[PDB]
Amino acid sequence: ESSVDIQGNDQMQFNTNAITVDKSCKQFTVNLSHPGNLPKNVMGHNWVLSTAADMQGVVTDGMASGLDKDYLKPDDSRVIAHTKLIGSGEKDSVTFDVPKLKEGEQYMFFCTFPGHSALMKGTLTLK
């Protein structure tokens, strides 16, 4: 709605595959946590938002950027918002302006750690 708590676990999945953002809000907050036991260098997760069209490009380039850049191309203009890459027992939050999004456009959230985006992706919709 206005804020969502998302968990990325050791089973390589987020708790949810769909987020809806209330268009009447000015900002939207994503709180990311990592239940489980594996550290970020093996089962790291971030939360990255792009249009569905741009997802593939963001993932491909992020995979090539490495752990120390949180598997994201620095200053990637396609990334609307993102957290850092976290491991078990860590947390990160990102707040972004809702006007960065528009109705009728399809958005996807995903993890860019290599391989994870096959399962760790979902839709975000403005309503």
Binding annotation: 45, 111, 116, 120
Binding annotation for Cu cation: 45, 111, 116, 120
Closest approach, Cβ 22 to a second copy, in A, equals 17
Classify 50 in phi/psi space as left (phi over 0), alpha (psi -120 to 50) or beta.
beta
**How far is the C-alpha of 85 from the C-alpha of 99, rounded, in Å?**
25
Among a second copy, Cu ion, none, the one that 111 touches (CB under a kind-dependent 5 to 8 A) is: Cu ion
Residues in the chain: 127
Interface with Cu ion includes 86 (CB under 5 A)? no
73 binds Cu ion (CB under 5 A): no
Contact mark string toward a second copy, 8..27, x via CB under 8 A: -xxxxxxxxxx---------
Give 76's Cβ-side CA count (13 Å radius).
Answer: 28
What residues have CB less than 8 Å from 109, skipping those under 6 apart? 14, 19, 47, 48, 49, 121, 122, 123, 124
Binding mask 36-55 for Cu ion (x = CB under 5 A): ---------x----------
Which residues of this chain interact with a second copy, rule CB under 8 A? Answer: 9-18, 35, 37-38, 41-43, 52-57, 60, 63-64, 67, 106, 108, 114-116, 118-119, 121-123
